[PDB]
Paper text:
The four-component transporter YknWXYZ in Bacillus has been implicated in the protection against SDP-dependent killing by expelling invading SDP toxin from the cytosol. YknWXYZ contains the ATP-binding cassette (ABC) transporter YknYZ, in which an individual protein YknY dimer associates with a respective permease (YknZ) that utilizes ATP hydrolysis as a driving force. The activity of YknYZ strictly depends on two accessory proteins, YknX and YknW. Unlike most dimeric ABC-type transporters, MacB and YknYZ are characterized as non-canonical ABC-type transporters, which consist of a four-transmembrane segment, an N-terminal nucleotide binding domain (NBD), and a large periplasmic domain.
Here, we present the first crystal structure of the extracellular domain of YknZ from Bacillus amyloliquefaciens. From the diffraction dataset, the crystals were found to belong to the orthorhombic space group P212121, with unit-cell parameters of a = 44.2, b = 46.2, and c = 87.5 Å. The refined model of Ba YknZ ED contains 188 residues from Asn58 to Asn256, and the N- and C-terminal regions of Ba YknZ ED were disordered in the crystal. The YknZ ED structure included a mixed α/β domain that was dispersed into upper and lower subdomains. The upper subdomain was formed by residues 103–219 and was composed of a seven-stranded antiparallel β-sheet with four α-helices. The lower subdomain was formed by residues 58–102 and 219–256 and consisted of three α-helices and a three-stranded antiparallel β-sheet. The DaliLite server revealed that the structure of Aa MacB PCD was highly similar to Ba YknZ ED, which was found to be the top match and showed a Z-score of 20.1 and sequence identity of up to 22%. We also found this crevice in the middle of the mixed α/β domain in the Ba YknZ ED structure, where it virtually divided the domain into two parts (Upper-right). The most significant structural difference is the number of β-strands; the lower subdomain of Ba YknZ ED contained three β-strands, while the other structures each contain four β-strands. The purified YknX protein was not bound to the CNbr-activated region, which is in sharp contrast to the strong binding of YknX to YknZ ED.
Author numbering: 16 to 33, 39 to 148, 156 to 214
Write the structure that this text describes.
Amino acid sequence: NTIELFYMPSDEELTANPASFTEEDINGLKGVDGVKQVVASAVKSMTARYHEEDTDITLNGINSGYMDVKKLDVQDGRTFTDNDFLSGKRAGIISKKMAEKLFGKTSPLGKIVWAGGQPVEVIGVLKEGLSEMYVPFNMLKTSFGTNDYSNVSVQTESADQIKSTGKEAARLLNDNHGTKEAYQVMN
């Protein structure tokens, strides 16, 4: 019962204005009829570093709805709290693979990993294939200057709402951005 929103401007759209979702967008969507939850992330590739070890990782800056909806399961340590998202703490939850690459069999919990030159305390390792770390989206703003989400889905209350909620959510997006039909769900 989730549907993803995409940004694809038409030629009619591009020649009026020479994938971006704002915080305003994420907050608006939550109030769209039929929306149970908003699933939002900013996905970026970069190197992560601990001591003498380097690996390439996926860093996901997410909102509070993302964990909610995604069956993301922490095996050791803890998951994010709503205040972690609020304050944008320098806190990260890492996959088993990236923990193994950077730490081997040593516990990563409490250690500082440097992602793209930014320090992040590992507060959780996920249940078990990819090297990826999750951090509060608000941490991306201050640390990397990332102020938009790259990927957004909405979860509906029921399956029969997808078509209409999806459409409404897409219109809302277009209206916030002043675009005609750039934002859309699959028809």
